[PDB]
Amino acid sequence: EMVRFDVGPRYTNLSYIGEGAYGMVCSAYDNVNKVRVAIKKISPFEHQTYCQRTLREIKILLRFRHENIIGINDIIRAPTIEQMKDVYIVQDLMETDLYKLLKTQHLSNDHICYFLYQILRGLKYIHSANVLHRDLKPSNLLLNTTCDLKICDFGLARVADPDHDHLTEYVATRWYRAPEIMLNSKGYTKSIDIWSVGCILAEMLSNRPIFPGKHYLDQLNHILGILGSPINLKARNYLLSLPHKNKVPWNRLFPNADSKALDLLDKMLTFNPHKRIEVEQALAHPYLEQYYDPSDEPIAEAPFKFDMELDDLPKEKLKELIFEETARFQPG
Ligand SMILES: c1ccc(Cn2cc(-c3c[nH]c4ncc(-c5ccncc5)nc34)cn2)cc1
């Protein structure tokens, strides 16, 4: 143990990396496989949406298997469900993320291009499984080298559902939230993930968030402040009929940017979801022609039969399902 509480076996001499939703996140050492790994410690059993995000990320990441998607190595808990109050997710130790990198470094076009490729390569897998990440942002893209990118945090990950109408349903990180979400186009579409990637590409090009709104109405203010002016929004919230703006050309916002990059950016940051470019079409863009290779882009074996449509479940129940899932990592 230490200070920062935790429990090895089978990992020792850890190190603080920070705290997110629930504590460490600590870089410990592996006794069996002989490496430095990253253990995440979760204590979600006090609320409902907490275990939900815990059970989701566990169920999904175990079934996923891709070079651009973080994997679950080990999960250690108390052998009895009565004592189980903490969960320890063990994952590969990554050096940093795209968020930290963009604070200390201007990325070259070559590096930006391959970073974009790896993200979409990972997204291609996710979407082929009919799954939405819903929370893509630079801090959720882990990096080891320029050629090693891994998507993480699937706590908000839903199975796609374009046909179904979902202050409930929360959240997508504001700066990277697609316009359709804020205008109650309630369907869970794959287009929301592409929007995030668009914002992410825009952020790589200039080391700053393209739409850094304060609140969700200010977010739409920023979005329309670039794309210009385009009503189904039945809140208020209605009075967005304010200063009408013309669409700002990307080459004026990013003058030193590769023209093919800016062209793909325009197609990802499209206001209308139905017009917005899909993941395969994105990879097949002239901007990624030197990397695009379907034979080297593994997709999921089969689309996900639903996330069990689980939202309103008692916490003592999904307590067991986590216990049922994680039972494989017990030595017995
Ligand atoms: C609480 C909850 C969720 C997160 C976000 N999240 C992090 C990982 C992760 C898995 N393995 C890693 N290895 C290294 C690093 C890392 C991060 C920031 N700087 C350096 C290294 N992050 C992860 C998955 N999801 C964070 C805290």
Side-chain angles (χ1 to χ4, degrees), residues 38-40 42-84:
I39 291 96
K40 188 188 293 184
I42 314 293
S43 299
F45 316 107
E46 193 238 346
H47 289 23
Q48 183 244 20
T49 60
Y50 294 0
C51 311
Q52 176 177 145
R53 294 171 176 175
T54 301
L55 176 62
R56 274 183 212 273
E57 193 179 27
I58 286 179
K59 290 184 63 61
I60 288 184
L61 288 187
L62 291 178
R63 299 187 60 179
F64 280 3
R65 211 197 71 216
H66 197 276
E67 289 178 356
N68 304 108
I69 297 178
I70 195 73
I72 300 282
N73 298 8
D74 204 37
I75 300 180
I76 301 305
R77 46 159 184 80
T80 66
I81 197 178
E82 51 174 353
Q83 188 178 359
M84 183 188 186

mmCIF file of all heavy atoms in Angstrom, residues 38-84, unseen atoms left out:
data_model
loop_
_atom_site.group_PDB
_atom_site.id
_atom_site.type_symbol
_atom_site.label_atom_id
_atom_site.label_comp_id
_atom_site.label_asym_id
_atom_site.label_seq_id
_atom_site.Cartn_x
_atom_site.Cartn_y
_atom_site.Cartn_z
ATOM 1 N N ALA A 38 -0.181 0.639 -15.586
ATOM 2 C CA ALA A 38 -1.008 1.687 -15.002
ATOM 3 C C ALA A 38 -2.288 1.117 -14.405
ATOM 4 O O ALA A 38 -3.182 0.689 -15.133
ATOM 5 C CB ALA A 38 -1.335 2.744 -16.043
ATOM 6 N N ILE A 39 -2.372 1.112 -13.079
ATOM 7 C CA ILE A 39 -3.568 0.637 -12.393
ATOM 8 C C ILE A 39 -4.517 1.794 -12.108
ATOM 9 O O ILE A 39 -4.110 2.822 -11.568
ATOM 10 C CB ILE A 39 -3.233 -0.077 -11.065
ATOM 11 C CG1 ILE A 39 -2.525 -1.406 -11.326
ATOM 12 C CG2 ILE A 39 -4.492 -0.330 -10.258
ATOM 13 C CD1 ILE A 39 -1.025 -1.329 -11.243
ATOM 14 N N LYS A 40 -5.781 1.624 -12.486
ATOM 15 C CA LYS A 40 -6.820 2.590 -12.153
ATOM 16 C C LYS A 40 -7.695 2.026 -11.036
ATOM 17 O O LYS A 40 -8.199 0.911 -11.143
ATOM 18 C CB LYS A 40 -7.670 2.916 -13.382
ATOM 19 C CG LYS A 40 -8.649 4.056 -13.168
ATOM 20 C CD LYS A 40 -9.598 4.219 -14.347
ATOM 21 C CE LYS A 40 -8.880 4.681 -15.601
ATOM 22 N NZ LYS A 40 -9.844 4.921 -16.712
ATOM 23 N N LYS A 41 -7.865 2.797 -9.964
ATOM 24 C CA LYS A 41 -8.659 2.358 -8.818
ATOM 25 C C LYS A 41 -10.028 3.028 -8.799
ATOM 26 O O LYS A 41 -10.121 4.249 -8.726
ATOM 27 C CB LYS A 41 -7.921 2.655 -7.513
ATOM 28 N N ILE A 42 -11.087 2.226 -8.850
ATOM 29 C CA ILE A 42 -12.442 2.764 -8.924
ATOM 30 C C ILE A 42 -13.267 2.461 -7.676
ATOM 31 O O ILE A 42 -13.298 1.327 -7.200
ATOM 32 C CB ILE A 42 -13.198 2.219 -10.155
ATOM 33 C CG1 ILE A 42 -12.318 2.297 -11.400
ATOM 34 C CG2 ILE A 42 -14.485 2.996 -10.376
ATOM 35 C CD1 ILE A 42 -12.029 3.710 -11.837
ATOM 36 N N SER A 43 -13.932 3.486 -7.151
ATOM 37 C CA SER A 43 -14.866 3.315 -6.043
ATOM 38 C C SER A 43 -16.216 3.918 -6.418
ATOM 39 O O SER A 43 -16.558 5.012 -5.967
ATOM 40 C CB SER A 43 -14.323 3.972 -4.773
ATOM 41 O OG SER A 43 -13.092 3.388 -4.380
ATOM 42 N N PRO A 44 -16.989 3.204 -7.250
ATOM 43 C CA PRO A 44 -18.221 3.744 -7.826
ATOM 44 C C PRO A 44 -19.478 3.352 -7.053
ATOM 45 O O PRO A 44 -20.552 3.883 -7.336
ATOM 46 C CB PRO A 44 -18.253 3.077 -9.198
ATOM 47 C CG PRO A 44 -17.678 1.714 -8.932
ATOM 48 C CD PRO A 44 -16.673 1.874 -7.804
ATOM 49 N N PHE A 45 -19.341 2.453 -6.083
ATOM 50 C CA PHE A 45 -20.494 1.806 -5.461
ATOM 51 C C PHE A 45 -21.288 2.702 -4.514
ATOM 52 O O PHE A 45 -22.095 2.215 -3.724
ATOM 53 C CB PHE A 45 -20.056 0.534 -4.738
ATOM 54 C CG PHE A 45 -19.090 -0.302 -5.524
ATOM 55 C CD1 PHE A 45 -17.755 -0.360 -5.164
ATOM 56 C CD2 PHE A 45 -19.514 -1.026 -6.624
ATOM 57 C CE1 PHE A 45 -16.863 -1.127 -5.884
ATOM 58 C CE2 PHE A 45 -18.627 -1.796 -7.349
ATOM 59 C CZ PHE A 45 -17.301 -1.847 -6.978
ATOM 60 N N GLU A 46 -21.067 4.008 -4.599
ATOM 61 C CA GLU A 46 -21.809 4.945 -3.769
ATOM 62 C C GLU A 46 -22.951 5.611 -4.549
ATOM 63 O O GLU A 46 -23.945 6.036 -3.962
ATOM 64 C CB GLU A 46 -20.866 5.982 -3.154
ATOM 65 C CG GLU A 46 -21.494 6.806 -2.050
ATOM 66 C CD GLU A 46 -21.452 8.292 -2.336
ATOM 67 O OE1 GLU A 46 -20.712 8.708 -3.255
ATOM 68 O OE2 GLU A 46 -22.166 9.046 -1.643
ATOM 69 N N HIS A 47 -22.809 5.686 -5.871
ATOM 70 C CA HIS A 47 -23.894 6.156 -6.734
ATOM 71 C C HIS A 47 -24.323 5.073 -7.722
ATOM 72 O O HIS A 47 -24.027 3.892 -7.530
ATOM 73 C CB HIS A 47 -23.499 7.424 -7.500
ATOM 74 C CG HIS A 47 -23.389 8.645 -6.638
ATOM 75 N ND1 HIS A 47 -23.168 8.582 -5.280
ATOM 76 C CD2 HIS A 47 -23.474 9.963 -6.943
ATOM 77 C CE1 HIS A 47 -23.119 9.806 -4.784
ATOM 78 N NE2 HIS A 47 -23.299 10.662 -5.773
ATOM 79 N N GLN A 48 -25.017 5.489 -8.778
ATOM 80 C CA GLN A 48 -25.536 4.570 -9.785
ATOM 81 C C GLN A 48 -24.846 4.755 -11.132
ATOM 82 O O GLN A 48 -24.369 3.791 -11.731
ATOM 83 C CB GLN A 48 -27.043 4.765 -9.946
ATOM 84 C CG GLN A 48 -27.684 3.798 -10.917
ATOM 85 C CD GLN A 48 -28.272 4.493 -12.124
ATOM 86 O OE1 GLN A 48 -27.906 5.625 -12.445
ATOM 87 N NE2 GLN A 48 -29.195 3.820 -12.800
ATOM 88 N N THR A 49 -24.799 5.997 -11.606
ATOM 89 C CA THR A 49 -24.152 6.306 -12.878
ATOM 90 C C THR A 49 -22.660 5.997 -12.823
ATOM 91 O O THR A 49 -21.999 5.877 -13.854
ATOM 92 C CB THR A 49 -24.335 7.783 -13.271
ATOM 93 O OG1 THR A 49 -23.753 8.625 -12.266
ATOM 94 C CG2 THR A 49 -25.810 8.115 -13.417
ATOM 95 N N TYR A 50 -22.144 5.870 -11.608
ATOM 96 C CA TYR A 50 -20.732 5.605 -11.381
ATOM 97 C C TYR A 50 -20.388 4.168 -11.749
ATOM 98 O O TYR A 50 -19.482 3.920 -12.544
ATOM 99 C CB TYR A 50 -20.383 5.859 -9.916
ATOM 100 C CG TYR A 50 -20.495 7.305 -9.483
ATOM 101 C CD1 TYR A 50 -20.887 8.299 -10.376
ATOM 102 C CD2 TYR A 50 -20.177 7.680 -8.185
ATOM 103 C CE1 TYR A 50 -20.975 9.622 -9.978
ATOM 104 C CE2 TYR A 50 -20.262 8.998 -7.781
ATOM 105 C CZ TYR A 50 -20.663 9.964 -8.681
ATOM 106 O OH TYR A 50 -20.750 11.276 -8.281
ATOM 107 N N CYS A 51 -21.116 3.226 -11.157
ATOM 108 C CA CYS A 51 -20.929 1.812 -11.450
ATOM 109 C C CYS A 51 -21.280 1.552 -12.907
ATOM 110 O O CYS A 51 -20.676 0.706 -13.564
ATOM 111 C CB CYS A 51 -21.827 0.955 -10.559
ATOM 112 S SG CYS A 51 -21.789 1.348 -8.799
ATOM 113 N N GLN A 52 -22.272 2.289 -13.392
ATOM 114 C CA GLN A 52 -22.711 2.212 -14.778
ATOM 115 C C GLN A 52 -21.546 2.478 -15.730
ATOM 116 O O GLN A 52 -21.278 1.688 -16.635
ATOM 117 C CB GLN A 52 -23.834 3.223 -15.005
ATOM 118 C CG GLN A 52 -24.338 3.324 -16.427
ATOM 119 C CD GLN A 52 -25.500 4.292 -16.544
ATOM 120 O OE1 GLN A 52 -25.570 5.003 -17.665
ATOM 121 N NE2 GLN A 52 -26.318 4.408 -15.630
ATOM 122 N N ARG A 53 -20.847 3.587 -15.508
ATOM 123 C CA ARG A 53 -19.674 3.930 -16.303
ATOM 124 C C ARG A 53 -18.545 2.934 -16.079
ATOM 125 O O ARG A 53 -17.706 2.727 -16.953
ATOM 126 C CB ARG A 53 -19.195 5.340 -15.962
ATOM 127 C CG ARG A 53 -20.163 6.432 -16.362
ATOM 128 C CD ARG A 53 -19.738 7.775 -15.803
ATOM 129 N NE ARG A 53 -20.614 8.848 -16.261
ATOM 130 C CZ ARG A 53 -20.528 10.108 -15.850
ATOM 131 N NH1 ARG A 53 -19.606 10.458 -14.965
ATOM 132 N NH2 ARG A 53 -21.368 11.019 -16.323
ATOM 133 N N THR A 54 -18.526 2.323 -14.898
ATOM 134 C CA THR A 54 -17.515 1.325 -14.570
ATOM 135 C C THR A 54 -17.826 0.002 -15.260
ATOM 136 O O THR A 54 -16.952 -0.613 -15.872
ATOM 137 C CB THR A 54 -17.416 1.101 -13.051
ATOM 138 O OG1 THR A 54 -17.089 2.338 -12.409
ATOM 139 C CG2 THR A 54 -16.345 0.072 -12.728
ATOM 140 N N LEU A 55 -19.078 -0.426 -15.164
ATOM 141 C CA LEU A 55 -19.516 -1.667 -15.792
ATOM 142 C C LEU A 55 -19.458 -1.580 -17.315
ATOM 143 O O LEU A 55 -19.118 -2.557 -17.984
ATOM 144 C CB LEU A 55 -20.932 -2.023 -15.333
ATOM 145 C CG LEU A 55 -21.588 -3.253 -15.968
ATOM 146 C CD1 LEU A 55 -20.809 -4.519 -15.648
ATOM 147 C CD2 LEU A 55 -23.031 -3.377 -15.512
ATOM 148 N N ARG A 56 -19.792 -0.413 -17.860
ATOM 149 C CA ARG A 56 -19.755 -0.204 -19.306
ATOM 150 C C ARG A 56 -18.343 -0.339 -19.856
ATOM 151 O O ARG A 56 -18.101 -1.113 -20.782
ATOM 152 C CB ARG A 56 -20.308 1.171 -19.679
ATOM 153 C CG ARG A 56 -21.812 1.216 -19.850
ATOM 154 C CD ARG A 56 -22.269 2.601 -20.279
ATOM 155 N NE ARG A 56 -23.591 2.914 -19.746
ATOM 156 C CZ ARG A 56 -24.734 2.588 -20.341
ATOM 157 N NH1 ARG A 56 -24.724 1.939 -21.499
ATOM 158 N NH2 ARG A 56 -25.889 2.913 -19.778
ATOM 159 N N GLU A 57 -17.421 0.424 -19.279
ATOM 160 C CA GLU A 57 -16.041 0.442 -19.738
ATOM 161 C C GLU A 57 -15.423 -0.943 -19.616
ATOM 162 O O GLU A 57 -14.634 -1.353 -20.461
ATOM 163 C CB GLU A 57 -15.220 1.465 -18.950
ATOM 164 C CG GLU A 57 -13.859 1.761 -19.559
ATOM 165 C CD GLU A 57 -13.080 2.800 -18.777
ATOM 166 O OE1 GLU A 57 -13.305 2.920 -17.555
ATOM 167 O OE2 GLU A 57 -12.242 3.499 -19.385
ATOM 168 N N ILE A 58 -15.796 -1.668 -18.568
ATOM 169 C CA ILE A 58 -15.309 -3.029 -18.383
ATOM 170 C C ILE A 58 -15.863 -3.978 -19.445
ATOM 171 O O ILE A 58 -15.100 -4.688 -20.096
ATOM 172 C CB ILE A 58 -15.629 -3.567 -16.970
ATOM 173 C CG1 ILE A 58 -14.710 -2.911 -15.937
ATOM 174 C CG2 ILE A 58 -15.476 -5.079 -16.924
ATOM 175 C CD1 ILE A 58 -14.960 -3.364 -14.516
ATOM 176 N N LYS A 59 -17.182 -3.983 -19.626
ATOM 177 C CA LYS A 59 -17.820 -4.871 -20.597
ATOM 178 C C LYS A 59 -17.298 -4.637 -22.009
ATOM 179 O O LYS A 59 -16.989 -5.580 -22.734
ATOM 180 C CB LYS A 59 -19.340 -4.702 -20.579
ATOM 181 C CG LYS A 59 -20.018 -5.237 -19.330
ATOM 182 C CD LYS A 59 -21.531 -5.123 -19.437
ATOM 183 C CE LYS A 59 -22.068 -5.980 -20.574
ATOM 184 N NZ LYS A 59 -21.765 -7.426 -20.368
ATOM 185 N N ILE A 60 -17.196 -3.369 -22.387
ATOM 186 C CA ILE A 60 -16.781 -3.000 -23.733
ATOM 187 C C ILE A 60 -15.301 -3.277 -24.008
ATOM 188 O O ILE A 60 -14.966 -3.938 -24.992
ATOM 189 C CB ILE A 60 -17.116 -1.525 -24.027
ATOM 190 C CG1 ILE A 60 -18.631 -1.368 -24.196
ATOM 191 C CG2 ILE A 60 -16.385 -1.042 -25.266
ATOM 192 C CD1 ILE A 60 -19.072 0.027 -24.578
ATOM 193 N N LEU A 61 -14.424 -2.789 -23.135
ATOM 194 C CA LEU A 61 -12.983 -2.920 -23.348
ATOM 195 C C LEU A 61 -12.484 -4.364 -23.357
ATOM 196 O O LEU A 61 -11.465 -4.671 -23.979
ATOM 197 C CB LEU A 61 -12.199 -2.098 -22.321
ATOM 198 C CG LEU A 61 -12.261 -0.582 -22.501
ATOM 199 C CD1 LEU A 61 -11.321 0.107 -21.528
ATOM 200 C CD2 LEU A 61 -11.941 -0.197 -23.940
ATOM 201 N N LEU A 62 -13.195 -5.246 -22.664
ATOM 202 C CA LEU A 62 -12.836 -6.659 -22.659
ATOM 203 C C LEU A 62 -13.136 -7.302 -24.009
ATOM 204 O O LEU A 62 -12.374 -8.141 -24.486
ATOM 205 C CB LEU A 62 -13.561 -7.406 -21.538
ATOM 206 C CG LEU A 62 -13.112 -7.064 -20.116
ATOM 207 C CD1 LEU A 62 -13.928 -7.834 -19.088
ATOM 208 C CD2 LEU A 62 -11.628 -7.323 -19.937
ATOM 209 N N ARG A 63 -14.239 -6.894 -24.628
ATOM 210 C CA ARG A 63 -14.627 -7.437 -25.925
ATOM 211 C C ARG A 63 -13.834 -6.808 -27.072
ATOM 212 O O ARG A 63 -13.622 -7.434 -28.112
ATOM 213 C CB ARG A 63 -16.134 -7.278 -26.149
ATOM 214 C CG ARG A 63 -16.980 -8.015 -25.117
ATOM 215 C CD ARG A 63 -18.460 -7.980 -25.464
ATOM 216 N NE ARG A 63 -18.732 -8.609 -26.756
ATOM 217 C CZ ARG A 63 -19.945 -8.733 -27.288
ATOM 218 N NH1 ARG A 63 -21.008 -8.273 -26.639
ATOM 219 N NH2 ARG A 63 -20.097 -9.318 -28.468
ATOM 220 N N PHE A 64 -13.392 -5.570 -26.877
ATOM 221 C CA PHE A 64 -12.591 -4.884 -27.885
ATOM 222 C C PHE A 64 -11.162 -5.410 -27.902
ATOM 223 O O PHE A 64 -10.654 -5.888 -26.889
ATOM 224 C CB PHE A 64 -12.581 -3.373 -27.644
ATOM 225 C CG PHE A 64 -13.811 -2.666 -28.146
ATOM 226 C CD1 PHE A 64 -14.860 -3.376 -28.705
ATOM 227 C CD2 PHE A 64 -13.909 -1.286 -28.068
ATOM 228 C CE1 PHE A 64 -15.985 -2.727 -29.166
ATOM 229 C CE2 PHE A 64 -15.029 -0.630 -28.530
ATOM 230 C CZ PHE A 64 -16.069 -1.352 -29.079
ATOM 231 N N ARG A 65 -10.522 -5.321 -29.062
ATOM 232 C CA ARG A 65 -9.133 -5.732 -29.212
ATOM 233 C C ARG A 65 -8.542 -5.039 -30.432
ATOM 234 O O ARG A 65 -8.778 -5.454 -31.564
ATOM 235 C CB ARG A 65 -9.034 -7.248 -29.371
ATOM 236 C CG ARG A 65 -7.758 -7.847 -28.810
ATOM 237 C CD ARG A 65 -7.532 -9.246 -29.351
ATOM 238 N NE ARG A 65 -7.161 -9.214 -30.763
ATOM 239 C CZ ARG A 65 -7.539 -10.120 -31.658
ATOM 240 N NH1 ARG A 65 -8.310 -11.136 -31.290
ATOM 241 N NH2 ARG A 65 -7.151 -10.006 -32.923
ATOM 242 N N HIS A 66 -7.779 -3.978 -30.193
ATOM 243 C CA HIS A 66 -7.272 -3.138 -31.272
ATOM 244 C C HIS A 66 -6.009 -2.410 -30.811
ATOM 245 O O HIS A 66 -5.807 -2.198 -29.615
ATOM 246 C CB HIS A 66 -8.354 -2.137 -31.686
ATOM 247 C CG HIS A 66 -8.119 -1.498 -33.019
ATOM 248 N ND1 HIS A 66 -7.302 -0.401 -33.186
ATOM 249 C CD2 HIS A 66 -8.608 -1.793 -34.246
ATOM 250 C CE1 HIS A 66 -7.290 -0.053 -34.460
ATOM 251 N NE2 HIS A 66 -8.075 -0.882 -35.125
ATOM 252 N N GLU A 67 -5.156 -2.032 -31.755
ATOM 253 C CA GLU A 67 -3.907 -1.359 -31.410
ATOM 254 C C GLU A 67 -4.118 0.089 -30.983
ATOM 255 O O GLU A 67 -3.270 0.674 -30.312
ATOM 256 C CB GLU A 67 -2.926 -1.412 -32.579
ATOM 257 C CG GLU A 67 -2.339 -2.781 -32.836
ATOM 258 C CD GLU A 67 -1.420 -2.785 -34.035
ATOM 259 O OE1 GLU A 67 -1.317 -1.730 -34.700
ATOM 260 O OE2 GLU A 67 -0.805 -3.836 -34.315
ATOM 261 N N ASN A 68 -5.246 0.667 -31.384
ATOM 262 C CA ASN A 68 -5.551 2.056 -31.062
ATOM 263 C C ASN A 68 -6.655 2.180 -30.018
ATOM 264 O O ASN A 68 -7.284 3.229 -29.882
ATOM 265 C CB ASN A 68 -5.929 2.827 -32.323
ATOM 266 C CG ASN A 68 -4.856 2.760 -33.382
ATOM 267 O OD1 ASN A 68 -5.013 2.088 -34.401
ATOM 268 N ND2 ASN A 68 -3.750 3.457 -33.148
ATOM 269 N N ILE A 69 -6.893 1.095 -29.290
ATOM 270 C CA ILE A 69 -7.863 1.100 -28.207
ATOM 271 C C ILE A 69 -7.274 0.419 -26.987
ATOM 272 O O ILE A 69 -6.870 -0.742 -27.057
ATOM 273 C CB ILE A 69 -9.149 0.369 -28.598
ATOM 274 C CG1 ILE A 69 -9.830 1.078 -29.765
ATOM 275 C CG2 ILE A 69 -10.089 0.291 -27.409
ATOM 276 C CD1 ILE A 69 -11.071 0.386 -30.220
ATOM 277 N N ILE A 70 -7.228 1.150 -25.876
ATOM 278 C CA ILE A 70 -6.652 0.646 -24.635
ATOM 279 C C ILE A 70 -7.347 -0.645 -24.202
ATOM 280 O O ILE A 70 -8.557 -0.802 -24.378
ATOM 281 C CB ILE A 70 -6.717 1.707 -23.503
ATOM 282 C CG1 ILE A 70 -5.804 1.324 -22.336
ATOM 283 C CG2 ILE A 70 -8.148 1.924 -23.032
ATOM 284 C CD1 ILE A 70 -4.331 1.500 -22.632
ATOM 285 N N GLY A 71 -6.569 -1.578 -23.664
ATOM 286 C CA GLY A 71 -7.110 -2.854 -23.237
ATOM 287 C C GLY A 71 -7.062 -3.039 -21.734
ATOM 288 O O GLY A 71 -6.285 -2.385 -21.041
ATOM 289 N N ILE A 72 -7.905 -3.934 -21.231
ATOM 290 C CA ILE A 72 -7.880 -4.300 -19.825
ATOM 291 C C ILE A 72 -6.944 -5.487 -19.629
ATOM 292 O O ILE A 72 -7.169 -6.559 -20.193
ATOM 293 C CB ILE A 72 -9.281 -4.692 -19.320
ATOM 294 C CG1 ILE A 72 -10.269 -3.533 -19.485
ATOM 295 C CG2 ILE A 72 -9.217 -5.140 -17.871
ATOM 296 C CD1 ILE A 72 -10.147 -2.467 -18.429
ATOM 297 N N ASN A 73 -5.893 -5.292 -18.839
ATOM 298 C CA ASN A 73 -4.943 -6.362 -18.548
ATOM 299 C C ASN A 73 -5.409 -7.243 -17.395
ATOM 300 O O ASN A 73 -5.501 -8.464 -17.527
ATOM 301 C CB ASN A 73 -3.562 -5.786 -18.223
ATOM 302 C CG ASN A 73 -2.963 -5.015 -19.380
ATOM 303 O OD1 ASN A 73 -3.627 -4.768 -20.386
ATOM 304 N ND2 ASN A 73 -1.702 -4.621 -19.238
ATOM 305 N N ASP A 74 -5.702 -6.613 -16.262
ATOM 306 C CA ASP A 74 -6.077 -7.330 -15.053
ATOM 307 C C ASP A 74 -7.063 -6.494 -14.240
ATOM 308 O O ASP A 74 -7.057 -5.265 -14.315
ATOM 309 C CB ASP A 74 -4.826 -7.631 -14.223
ATOM 310 C CG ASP A 74 -5.006 -8.814 -13.291
ATOM 311 O OD1 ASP A 74 -5.677 -9.791 -13.682
ATOM 312 O OD2 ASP A 74 -4.466 -8.770 -12.167
ATOM 313 N N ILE A 75 -7.922 -7.164 -13.477
ATOM 314 C CA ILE A 75 -8.854 -6.480 -12.585
ATOM 315 C C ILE A 75 -8.901 -7.172 -11.228
ATOM 316 O O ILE A 75 -9.387 -8.297 -11.114
ATOM 317 C CB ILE A 75 -10.281 -6.436 -13.156
ATOM 318 C CG1 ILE A 75 -10.311 -5.705 -14.498
ATOM 319 C CG2 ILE A 75 -11.215 -5.759 -12.172
ATOM 320 C CD1 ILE A 75 -11.688 -5.633 -15.120
ATOM 321 N N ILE A 76 -8.400 -6.498 -10.200
ATOM 322 C CA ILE A 76 -8.331 -7.097 -8.873
ATOM 323 C C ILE A 76 -9.322 -6.466 -7.899
ATOM 324 O O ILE A 76 -9.404 -5.244 -7.780
ATOM 325 C CB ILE A 76 -6.902 -7.028 -8.301
ATOM 326 C CG1 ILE A 76 -5.931 -7.761 -9.231
ATOM 327 C CG2 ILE A 76 -6.852 -7.628 -6.906
ATOM 328 C CD1 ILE A 76 -6.331 -9.197 -9.523
ATOM 329 N N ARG A 77 -10.078 -7.320 -7.216
ATOM 330 C CA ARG A 77 -11.059 -6.892 -6.227
ATOM 331 C C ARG A 77 -11.012 -7.836 -5.031
ATOM 332 O O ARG A 77 -10.176 -8.738 -4.976
ATOM 333 C CB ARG A 77 -12.461 -6.906 -6.834
ATOM 334 C CG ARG A 77 -12.761 -8.171 -7.618
ATOM 335 C CD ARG A 77 -14.252 -8.403 -7.775
ATOM 336 N NE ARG A 77 -14.512 -9.672 -8.446
ATOM 337 C CZ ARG A 77 -14.479 -10.856 -7.842
ATOM 338 N NH1 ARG A 77 -14.198 -10.934 -6.548
ATOM 339 N NH2 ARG A 77 -14.725 -11.962 -8.529
ATOM 340 N N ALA A 78 -11.912 -7.626 -4.076
ATOM 341 C CA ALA A 78 -12.041 -8.534 -2.943
ATOM 342 C C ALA A 78 -12.814 -9.777 -3.371
ATOM 343 O O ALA A 78 -13.877 -9.666 -3.984
ATOM 344 C CB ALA A 78 -12.739 -7.842 -1.786
ATOM 345 N N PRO A 79 -12.281 -10.967 -3.048
ATOM 346 C CA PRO A 79 -12.858 -12.256 -3.457
ATOM 347 C C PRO A 79 -14.318 -12.453 -3.045
ATOM 348 O O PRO A 79 -14.984 -13.337 -3.583
ATOM 349 C CB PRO A 79 -11.963 -13.275 -2.746
ATOM 350 C CG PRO A 79 -10.658 -12.577 -2.598
ATOM 351 C CD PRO A 79 -11.009 -11.142 -2.325
ATOM 352 N N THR A 80 -14.805 -11.647 -2.107
ATOM 353 C CA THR A 80 -16.200 -11.722 -1.686
ATOM 354 C C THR A 80 -16.955 -10.451 -2.070
ATOM 355 O O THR A 80 -16.427 -9.345 -1.951
ATOM 356 C CB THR A 80 -16.322 -11.956 -0.168
ATOM 357 O OG1 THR A 80 -15.831 -10.810 0.537
ATOM 358 C CG2 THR A 80 -15.524 -13.184 0.247
ATOM 359 N N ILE A 81 -18.192 -10.616 -2.527
ATOM 360 C CA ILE A 81 -19.002 -9.493 -2.992
ATOM 361 C C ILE A 81 -19.423 -8.572 -1.844
ATOM 362 O O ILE A 81 -19.785 -7.414 -2.058
ATOM 363 C CB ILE A 81 -20.248 -9.984 -3.772
ATOM 364 C CG1 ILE A 81 -20.857 -8.850 -4.600
ATOM 365 C CG2 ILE A 81 -21.272 -10.599 -2.828
ATOM 366 C CD1 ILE A 81 -22.046 -9.273 -5.426
ATOM 367 N N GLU A 82 -19.359 -9.093 -0.622
ATOM 368 C CA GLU A 82 -19.692 -8.312 0.563
ATOM 369 C C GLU A 82 -18.587 -7.310 0.884
ATOM 370 O O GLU A 82 -18.851 -6.224 1.403
ATOM 371 C CB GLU A 82 -19.919 -9.238 1.761
ATOM 372 C CG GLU A 82 -18.795 -10.237 1.985
ATOM 373 C CD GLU A 82 -18.973 -11.051 3.251
ATOM 374 O OE1 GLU A 82 -19.903 -10.751 4.030
ATOM 375 O OE2 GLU A 82 -18.181 -11.993 3.468
ATOM 376 N N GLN A 83 -17.351 -7.680 0.567
ATOM 377 C CA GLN A 83 -16.191 -6.856 0.886
ATOM 378 C C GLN A 83 -15.823 -5.939 -0.279
ATOM 379 O O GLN A 83 -15.167 -4.913 -0.091
ATOM 380 C CB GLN A 83 -15.002 -7.749 1.255
ATOM 381 C CG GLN A 83 -13.790 -7.008 1.794
ATOM 382 C CD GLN A 83 -12.661 -7.946 2.179
ATOM 383 O OE1 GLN A 83 -12.785 -9.165 2.059
ATOM 384 N NE2 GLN A 83 -11.554 -7.379 2.645
ATOM 385 N N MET A 84 -16.258 -6.313 -1.479
ATOM 386 C CA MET A 84 -15.949 -5.562 -2.693
ATOM 387 C C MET A 84 -16.441 -4.120 -2.622
ATOM 388 O O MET A 84 -17.627 -3.846 -2.815
ATOM 389 C CB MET A 84 -16.548 -6.259 -3.917
ATOM 390 C CG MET A 84 -16.216 -5.595 -5.247
ATOM 391 S SD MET A 84 -17.144 -6.317 -6.617
ATOM 392 C CE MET A 84 -16.419 -5.469 -8.012
#
